[PDB]
């Protein structure tokens, strides 16, 4: 029941190494630059 | 008539002074009621190269 599929690394490695960092950097860059009301 | 005699040796009691617990020679004592009338000269300079400083009456005591 626990064993993940044999293709899990193919999806999660690019996802956590290329995709989430891109969204995280965009989120952080916008946040720090945001001006107070 | 106020302060130690000119040329006498006094011991400094200002904790923030470079010469705390050290002996210096009195150069002059102002009689105008200023905050720090006593002028003392030292034979060893401080970190800025100065060898003289002004002290209040209660910050200086006679040698011993």
């Amino acid at each position: 029941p626990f064993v993940p599929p044999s293709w899990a690394p193919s999806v999660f490695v690019p996802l956590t190494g290329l995709v989430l960092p891109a969204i995280a950097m965009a989120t952080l860059f916008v946040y720090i630059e945001k001006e107070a009301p | 008539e106020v302060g130690p005699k000119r040329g006498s040796l006094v011991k400094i009691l200002r904790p923030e002074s470079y010469w705390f617990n050290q002996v210096g020679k009195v150069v002059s004592v102002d009689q105008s009621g200023v905050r720090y009338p006593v002028v003392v000269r030292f034979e060893n300079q401080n970190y800025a190269g100065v060898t003289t400083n002004n002290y209040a009456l209660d910050e200086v005591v006679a040698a011993k």
Binding site: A22, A26, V30, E33, K34, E35 | -
Partner: protein, 124 residues
């Protein structure tokens, strides 16, 4: 004032820059985005195809290189978009505004990907 120099102040140089899409005012920001995106997108495919990890494969080299050029254009489009968000939060040219830059970034994505696709068609 500033140190005058032919490079900084020359007639021939000034005219050339004034005709570039970036400096050509009077054009909608979206259209300027497409014009700029196409030029960079077309060039971006070159180095990936010739020097990529799959460069020596006969037919896969063209596809892999162009597909990586398309990816880089997508990343650049994100950079353009977030730059507008940070820079323009509150003047003569419409481009340098929150509304203008958002259109500019969208045009770059459309033009850039079209240029990458157009470059691929040239090969095959």
């Amino acid at each position: 004032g500033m140190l005058e120099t032919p490079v900084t102040s020359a007639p021939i140089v000034a005219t050339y820059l004034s005709n570039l899409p970036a400096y050509r005012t009077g054009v909608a920001p979206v259209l300027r985005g497409v014009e700029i995106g196409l030029a960079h997108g077309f060039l971006l495919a070159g180095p990936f195809i010739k020097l990529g990890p799959l460069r020596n494969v006969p037919e896969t080299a063209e596809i892999a290189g162009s597909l990586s050029a398309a990816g880089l254009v997508l990343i650049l489009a994100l950079c353009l978009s977030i730059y507008g968000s940070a820079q323009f939060q509150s003047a003569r040219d419409p481009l340098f505004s929150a509304d203008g830059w958002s259109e500019f970034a969208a045009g770059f994505l459309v033009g850039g990907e079209a240029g990458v696709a157009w470059a691929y068609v040239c090969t095959q």
